[PDB]
Design a protein. Structure first.
Lengths: 102, 48, 48, 48
């Protein structure tokens, strides 16, 4: 209906991040190698310090957002359902799982 | 999808769950009809 | 019991007969196991 | 599977018993009167 296998989901996420990235590129347009040693086969690839910092910031930011949204579902989740008796939080959470099982 | 496992016998943690998580068709046979009728009638006959 | 009620009707007033007949149908309980006793005699009653 | 007695065999049985209880000229036992002369004596034994 319904669930999605772990592949299709992976693809969808890939596309989503592609769009986000392309938006960084457009907004950046609006505001405006391979060396392998002979001694060892160790490969080295020249890097732009920019876009690496931007990458780290992107990952951290998205992690923050996910953590926060899940946290809001934490908050509402416990405050919404007051019907049945409960001894502790963990009980109420379990019985909401029983609401998911219906 | 596997449902949750809820037993009458044990709730070690203390999860409190609704009574309906804790909480026949076939009717009689015509043999009962026959038997009751036979005792009924033979009883009447004897008494008479 | 359908028979017991009658054969006790012969010997005894229908009040005691019906009483005895009903007394044998009772839930029987051993720990978890429980079942109504729908058929045979319970030999533990004082008047069994 | 229903009862095993069958209506016929039951009728035969009840007939047998009736024939006997007339052969003996038996009185159905009376239910205890509200006043019974021996009633106290019996009660004492049962409690004992």
């Amino acid at each position: 209906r319904g669930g999605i296998s772990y592949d299709q989901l992976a693809k969808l996420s890939y596309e989503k991040t592609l769009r986000n990235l392309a938006t960084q590129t457009q907004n950046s347009s609006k505001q405006d190698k391979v060396q392998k040693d002979t001694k060892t086969g160790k490969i080295t690839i020249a890097d732009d310090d920019k876009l690496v910092n931007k990458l780290a910031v992107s990952l951290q930011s998205e992690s923050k957002k996910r953590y926060e949204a899940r946290k809001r579902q934490m908050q509402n989740a416990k405050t919404l359902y007051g019907v049945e008796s409960f001894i502790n939080d963990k009980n109420k959470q379990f019985n909401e799982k029983l609401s998911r099982e219906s | 999808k596997i449902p949750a496992a809820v037993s009458n016998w044990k709730n070690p943690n203390g999860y409190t769950v609704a009574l309906e998580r804790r909480v026949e068709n076939n009717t009689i046979n015509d043999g009962f009809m026959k038997l009751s009728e036979a005792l009924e009638n033979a009883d009447k006959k004897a008494r008479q | 019991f359908t028979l017991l009620n009658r054969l006790l009707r012969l010997i005894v007033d229908p009040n005691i007969a019906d009483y005895i007949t009903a007394k044998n149908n009772v839930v029987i309980n051993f720990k978890d196991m429980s079942h109504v006793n729908k058929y045979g005699l319970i030999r533990g009653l004082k008047f069994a | 599977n229903g009862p095993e007695i069958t209506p016929e065999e039951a009728t035969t049985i009840f007939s047998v018993m009736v024939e006997w209880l007339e052969s003996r000229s038996f009185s159905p036992i009376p239910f205890p009167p509200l006043t019974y002369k021996n009633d106290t004596k019996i009660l004492v034994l049962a409690l004992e």
